[PDB]
Write a protein that binds this ligand. Structure first.
Ligand SMILES: [Ca+2]
Ligand SMILES: [Ca+2]
Ligand SMILES: [Ca+2]
Ligand SMILES: [Ca+2]
Length: 298
DNA sequence: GGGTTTCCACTTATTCAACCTTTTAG
DNA sequence: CCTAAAAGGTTGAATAAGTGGAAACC
């Protein structure tokens, strides 16, 4: 059932789940020896295929396909379709550092719109653009286009623009979790509700702003080898009851995350009724938990 | 139909989400 | 003593991003 997604929900979701793409491919059938492909894409779990169909219908662009065993993607690379992407993100701009990637995608669009990508000089300009996009140059492009190139990206400083963006972002990178803490009590399990949003460290400022915007929570920094990311986290029930739950009751989530939030809420009500301290209440929470998050079948 | 664009199957890197246990706060 | 909140992580790919191959187009 195709439903129109609000454009700021969509942009918040794009900030959490979109990726731009710029292919500069060796091609023995291209006059300059390289062909290109420019686009935007989203990859989700199969259980969320509906989001992709809603976006495909809301925009009128893109093609949907399996992405391996368990995921599905919406890719938009038809050049004329990319005008839709630009019109959307011009009106409802990305908020995270991905915004810099959007601007690089715009620059590549302009090169191609002037048909300059059919010249080697235009291929070279696309390479300079791609050197700053996402993961930058591949080994093949480094080898083929030796050049000291600026690598500094525009640092993005933008406030959360409105709460629909936040609902979109949370639908992508958020998590509603029932933590079962093993204790020695007679019941022997403490039920703890956790709300989290996870993000690369490059957007520490935006994540830190969530403390102010939502009136609760804290930031946990995590490092693993050379990689760093952050979790905005809320574990205090009174904050979950009075701030997190009413926020998302008002600003609706999309996809499977919505059902997780609803289940989470059913656990919160049980907790408020103190039935998490009874055996029968705990069994019910355990049963709700088994069907949340990755365990959910559909 | 030659050069170019678009699509579709599928993979690589690593940023997510989701999942744990132990300790501290109240 | 008791429960709630925070601290302190780990797991593993539903990560973000990218690739190989060719059909479709004009
Ligand atoms: Ca994300
Ligand atoms: Ca994704
Ligand atoms: Ca997600
Ligand atoms: Ca995500």
């Amino acid at each position: 059932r195709r439903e129109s997604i609000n454009p700021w929900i969509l942009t918040g979701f794009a900030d959490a789940e979109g990726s731009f793409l710029l292919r500069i491919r060796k091609n023995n059938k291209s006059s300059v020896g390289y062909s290109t492909e420019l686009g935007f894409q989203i990859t989700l779990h199969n259980k969320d295929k509906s989001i992709l169909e809603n976006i495909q219908s809301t925009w009128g662009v893109g093609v949907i396909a399996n992405s391996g065993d368990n995921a599905v993607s919406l890719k938009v690379t038809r050049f004329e379709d990319l005008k839709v992407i630009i019109d959307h993100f011009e009106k409802y701009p990305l908020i995270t550092q991905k915004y810099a990637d959007y601007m690089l995608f715009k620059q590549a669009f302009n090169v191609m719109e002037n048909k300059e990508h059919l010249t080697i000089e235009g291929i070279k300009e696309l390479v300079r653009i791609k050197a700053k996009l996402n993961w930058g140059l591949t080994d093949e492009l480094k080898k083929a286009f030796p050049e000291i190139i600026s690598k500094e990206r525009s640092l993005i400083n933008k406030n959360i623009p409105n709460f629909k963006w936040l609902a979109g972002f949370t639908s992508g990178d958020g998590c509603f979790f029932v933590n079962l803490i093993k204790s020695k009590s007679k019941l022997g399990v403490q039920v703890q509700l956790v709300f989290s949003i996870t993000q690369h460290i490059r957007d520490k400022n935006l994540m830190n702003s969530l403390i102010t915007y939502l009136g609760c929570g804290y930031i946990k920094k995590k490092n693993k080898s050379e990689f760093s990311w952050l979790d905005f986290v809320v574990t205090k029930f009174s904050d979950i009851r009075d701030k997190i739950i009413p926020f998302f009751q008002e600003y609706t989530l999309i996809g499977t995350k919505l059902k997780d939030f609803e289940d989470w809420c059913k656990v919160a009500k049980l907790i408020e009724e103190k039935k998490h301290l009874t055996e029968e209440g705990l069994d019910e929470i355990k049963k709700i938990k088994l069907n949340m998050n990755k365990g959910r079948v559909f």
